[PDB]
Design a binder for this molecule. Sequence first.
Ligand code: HEM
Ligand code: HEM
Ligand SMILES: COC(=O)N(OC)c1ccccc1COc1ccn(-c2ccc(Cl)cc2)n1
Lengths: 62, 49, 79, 378, 445, 106
Amino acid sequence: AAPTLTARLYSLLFRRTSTFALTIAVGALFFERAFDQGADAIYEHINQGKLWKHIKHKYENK
Amino acid sequence: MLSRFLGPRYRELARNWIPTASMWGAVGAVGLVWATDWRLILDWVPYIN
Amino acid sequence: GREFGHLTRMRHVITYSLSPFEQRAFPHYFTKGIPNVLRRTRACILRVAPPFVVFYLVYTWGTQEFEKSKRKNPAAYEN
Amino acid sequence: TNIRKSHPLMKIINNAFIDLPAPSNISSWWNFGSLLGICLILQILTGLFLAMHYTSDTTTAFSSVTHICRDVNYGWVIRYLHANGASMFFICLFIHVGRGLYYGSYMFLETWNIGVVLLFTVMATAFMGYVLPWGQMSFWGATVITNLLSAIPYIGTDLVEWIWGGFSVDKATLTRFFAFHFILPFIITALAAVHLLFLHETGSNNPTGISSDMDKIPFHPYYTIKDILGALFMMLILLILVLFSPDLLGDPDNYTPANPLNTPPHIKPEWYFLFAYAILRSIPNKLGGVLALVASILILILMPMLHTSKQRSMMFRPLSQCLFWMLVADLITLTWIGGQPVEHPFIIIGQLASILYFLIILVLMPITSIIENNLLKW
Amino acid sequence: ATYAQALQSVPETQVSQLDNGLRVASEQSSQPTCTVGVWIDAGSRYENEKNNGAGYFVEHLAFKGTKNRPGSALEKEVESMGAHLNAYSTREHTAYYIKALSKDLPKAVELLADIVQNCSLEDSQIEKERDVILQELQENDSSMRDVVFDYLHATAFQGTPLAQSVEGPSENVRKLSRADLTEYVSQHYKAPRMVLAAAGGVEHRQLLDLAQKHFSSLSGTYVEDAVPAFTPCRFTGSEIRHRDDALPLAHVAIAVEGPGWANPDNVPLQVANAIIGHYDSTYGGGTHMSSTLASVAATRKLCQSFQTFNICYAETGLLGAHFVCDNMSIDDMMFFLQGQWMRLCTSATESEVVRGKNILRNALVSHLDGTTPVCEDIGRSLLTYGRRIPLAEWESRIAEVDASVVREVCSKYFYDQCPAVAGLGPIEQLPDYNRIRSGMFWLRF
Amino acid sequence: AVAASSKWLEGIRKWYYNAAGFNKLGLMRDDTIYEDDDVKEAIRRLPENLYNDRVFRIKRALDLTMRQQILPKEQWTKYEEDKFYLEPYLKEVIRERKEREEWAKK
Ligand code: HEM
Ligand code: HEM
Ligand SMILES: COC(=O)N(OC)c1ccccc1COc1ccn(-c2ccc(Cl)cc2)n1
């Protein structure tokens, strides 16, 4: 009866609910700068060649 | 006359409670800079720039 | 839970009262009141008043030494 | 079947004002709590008028206030009701705190601690109302706060820039001072209902310091007619200062407009801040001076811990009564020194009186209660 | 002269075995009386749904007449020498035993061998023992403590043999035939499942030769002799609520899953339950007592009684508490009890553990006082541990418990676990299961 | 505990008793104590005749203060007639609190 990989770190960090009181602060990363994969790479792909920083090399260093 | 801290049995008062707080005096250096827009710990790691 | 029937325990005490319409609203006013407000003044005068006397002496020394440090110069005003 | 004992809204009023048990020997010093509730309501129905006709900018603030005394109908009476009504609030607040200090009312711990919060909130509100008319006293009084507020070693330089509207003296300075002044009087009204809910758990203290559960009377009609008479005597004093000398409590130099034009002949706030301005001015360090400003009001929270007498009040303590009136005469000295220029006799006096204010509360009062304990053979 | 020296001078237990597998054990203690009995691995956890009232029906007919001594002739022989007969049945054990004079030992062993081997299950004593058992079930319904512990087993072990009751349902009692009782004895009253124990004025050599004279015709290995299969039983977090407002007081039992018999965690879990304690309203200690839950319930008049238990089976068990209170006090008793469990998972001090170790030492030696509790401890320790654990070995296990051990074992069994709850009576103020389950973890640690 | 100031320090004690004025309201010294939790347990342990005497003396003094009046000088409480009726009951309540506190740390 080998279990699955849901014993994540339950015996390591999550038992004594020390994590739960401060996940607004401590467990808070991986979801602003790791989501450069998110909206900005999607939004500029639907609007390729239409934003200002696409038509930009045409009008500096002239 | 606040000598309730001074006792020979409740010296283990602080030994069951500080293993919670191994990071809890520095969570302001982990968690508040998530919203300060400073660079306090943002030079420590190449994780974030 | 602080209502009138539940406050404290009391035994052997009698009170007598008169109606307000049966008495005069102003009894002895200057016969009793003037000797009463004078011994109340005597009982508290040695506790309240001596601090405010020391404020008066510091105030007079502080405004008079302010002027003769400034432009009041009779005799220290030579070559 | 008595409707004032069974209706859900009427029975709250009955337990609070009508059938409430009250001590029978309560003095006139217990009148000033309902007087503070009259002064707070009056400052709300008069601040309605002023914020209606108002514009807060660096170019028009000084003229927006002069428009009301001449052009706006019934504006001279309502403006000076508001400027003298705030002086009335502060005299009814210092009597109120000195009562509870004298009779040991701070032993009601939760009621006393909400009171210290109420003393901070009205002090910060009135500071952000004297900066609104924009005269010489408004400018130079605000620009000595930020010298000690930028002295905070880490966050202070971005703190003052966030509250100045964004740079310095500009149009939007008086959009954050005015915002912090419209809304702070309503946190006071909610903090006052909580303040009375904690007092209702024990009832009132009395001048003897002894519990009075064998001698209670109803609140109506004995103290409802006594609080109405005391409020009528307060309206007589307030309307005399408005209709016969409306500029007695004030400074003429705040009629000279605000500009960095020239340094003023003096710098002084209103009378109820002169004790606090005298303390910080006698410290030649902009960090030591901002610490002793907050330590002059938050020292009231240590009064339950510093109590060493076996009795509660000061009615039977003659040696402690002498020290209480030395403290009142020490606050009169600081109010006088804080309106004087910084010269030779007013620096040695203004800094020894700053020391004696802390020496009485912390050291002299706990030792004297112990000496009186030994003289009564306990 | 010392408590340590007195544990060395306790007489030891001697164990032997016959050719059929029957074990024989004794402790000699130089007194004119004795207690001898037979302990069997049989019980309601070995029954299925078709014969759940079979072992309790057989205990009733055990003293009603055998082949050699029919009817009341067995009862006349025990009474005429001044001896006593007794029996019981749990979920895993069954015992019959005799208290007699120590010179009546050969007659006592002879009667015991005739009871377990040659008991007549005659068809007229059946159909008149049904009505005695059916009336005894209606008497059991008036005992609120027995009903609420039957509810706790039925909800903690829902679809297993360990959830059944010893007595069995009333429809089984009406229909158990003579054939079902003869199959129960042939399958379960077997010689490697039996222990013959004795304590008092007994010599071990005399009991061994009496066992060869009367018990040697027991079948050693059996027809086809298949291994008795042991299906384990799982624990389920759940609850059962029986609402009856006409009863004057309310009964509540709550437990988590505990360790088995041979688990070494049992000793520090009994030091922990001795710190919580027990209370009753006829106690004289009251508000001064060392247990926090006892001192609170005496000051505020919160309950009539409470107790903590440690029930063990071969592989699992129940670890919890039971209390009785009025309809306005259920929410406060559950709040204070759960706060004492969480205060031992964390925060347990060394001075509490010293008191709880002294309580367990006193309760172990107070049980073994007299020939009947010593003989019962011999008979059920050989079925449970395979040996008798002496008092010197119990003391060396107790002496290695300290405050950090109690914190580790209580956190393993209590912290963030699903309990089983049973409630009976005026229980409208018994809290919701979500609010009970949230009481098994803290905010801080 | 000085034998040379045995009478002198009793003059300052008698002076302070008259400067404080609970004797002008007809009160004893133990009437004026602040009622914390140890004092409230000592009042509950008083015999029934000493409890009823204390309740009336406090009510008569609260009624005098309402009127801003004092008693005639022949009805004032004398210095060498003041009975410390509460002091034996209060020393025992405090000794029991200090026993439960050494036990909780040892
Ligand atoms: C907006 C400010 C305030 C309001 C509206 C207010 C209101 C009241 C009222 C109505 C009472 C009851 C009647 C009375 O005894 O006067 C009271 C009592 C009391 N107040 Fe205030 N108060 C305020 C500020 C303060 C402050 C600043 C303090 C102390 C630092 C304080 C501490 C107390 C205490 C201790 C009592 C009980 C006194 C006693 O019964 O002897 N309050 N307050
Ligand atoms: C605790 C209550 C209050 C206090 C202590 C207070 C205090 C003051 C002070 C000292 C001034 C300066 C007057 C002058 O220097 O001429 C003022 C004016 C002003 N107040 Fe208030 N006030 C209170 C309530 C309010 C309220 C409720 C409002 C808004 C609804 C308000 C808004 C204003 C405005 C806009 C001014 C500027 C108008 C003027 O200067 O005449 N204030 N107040
Ligand atoms: C009516 O307004 C004035 O008197 N103001 O401010 C415009 C003024 C005008 C000129 C000079 C100085 C001031 C202010 O002087 C002080 C001294 C202490 N506080 C203070 C303020 C808030 C708090 Cl919480 C605590 C203490 N203020």
